[PDB]
């Protein structure tokens, strides 16, 4: 780019004799002034640069904040979510522990029909047997068998 | 730094190679402190600028860093909320299971007095019946003899 400080000073040392070369004077000196015109370019370039990048700066601090508000939002609506789980996995609990009662009453129940059923099976089957000694025996007309058969033929 | 006009009048001094020594010396020292300085400013600048370019850049990494970490939770609260609806209909269905079972219960018990009444009913008829062969005992009849040994049948 422009000239540097050992050079520029290489200049003002050729201008310090008061008699040399008078055109590498005058030489000396435009040298002197397109290199001051354009470091004042450059440090203007440079000034530019600087103030755009601080608009883009705090361009991207209003993106930023957004982001960071947004993101909050959904960290927010995440535990929340995570706390519906929660409530909804332990209400699975306590209704699997009631389903896993009943179903133990029910086996209870069941086994108990069964052994109801098989017992009043067992006392018909009883009568039946005691009808047909008693309907075997009828000729003999005894009152003490129909008795047992007025017994085994009355109705709820 | 001294503004294009009074690096000019510097030069316009220097262009006379007849200038007292005294001020050519002063005027050369002019332009070497400024040419100096204005480097200073200038690279006071450029690291200022790259400081800039650094912090926008952090700050991009940061904003975009900021945008994946709310697509993860965007993503992630979907798949939380479909989720519960997957739980909630496991826990709708433990419900009717629970219902379901307690309709079971109530019919069983039901059925069970239910048997219990019919099961006293023919045991009470079977009682009467051995109480008529008790109270007749002393008659020494092989019929009710009979009927002694089915009451008194076992199941096996």
Same mark, same amino acid.
């Given at each position: 780019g422009?000239?540097?400080? +050992?050079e520029? =000073? ?6 310090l004799?008061?008699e040399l070369?008078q $055109?590498?004077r *005058? #030489?000396? @000196?435009?040298?002197?002034r ?11 370039d440079?000034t ?17 904040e957004?982001?960071? +508000?947004?993101? =909050?939002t ?7 979510l995570?706390?519906?789980? $929660?409530?909804? *996995? #332990?209400? @699975? ?8 009662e009943?179903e ?6 069941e086994a108990?029909?069964?052994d109801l059923e ?7 089957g009883?009568?039946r047997?005691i009808?047909?000694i008693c309907?075997?025996?009828?000729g003999?007309n005894?009152?003490?068998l129909?008795?047992?058969?007025d017994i085994?033929?009355?109705?709820d």
């Amino acid at each position: 780019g422009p000239l540097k400080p +050992e050079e520029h =000073e290489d200049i003002l040392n050729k201008l310090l004799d008061p008699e040399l070369a008078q $055109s590498e004077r *005058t #030489e000396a @000196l435009q040298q002197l002034r397109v290199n001051y015109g354009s470091f004042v370019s450059e440090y203007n370039d440079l000034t530019k640069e600087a103030r755009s990048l601080s608009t883009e700066l705090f361009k991207l601090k209003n993106a930023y904040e957004e982001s960071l +508000e947004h993101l =909050e939002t959904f960290k927010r609506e995440n535990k929340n979510l995570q706390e519906e789980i $929660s409530d909804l *996995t #332990e209400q @699975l609990g306590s209704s699997g522990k009631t389903i896993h009662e009943l179903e133990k009453v029910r086996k209870q129940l069941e086994a108990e029909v069964e052994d109801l059923e098989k017992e009043r099976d067992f006392y018909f089957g009883k009568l039946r047997n005691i009808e047909l000694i008693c309907q075997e025996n009828e000729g003999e007309n005894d009152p003490v068998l129909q008795r047992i058969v007025d017994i085994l033929y009355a109705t709820d």
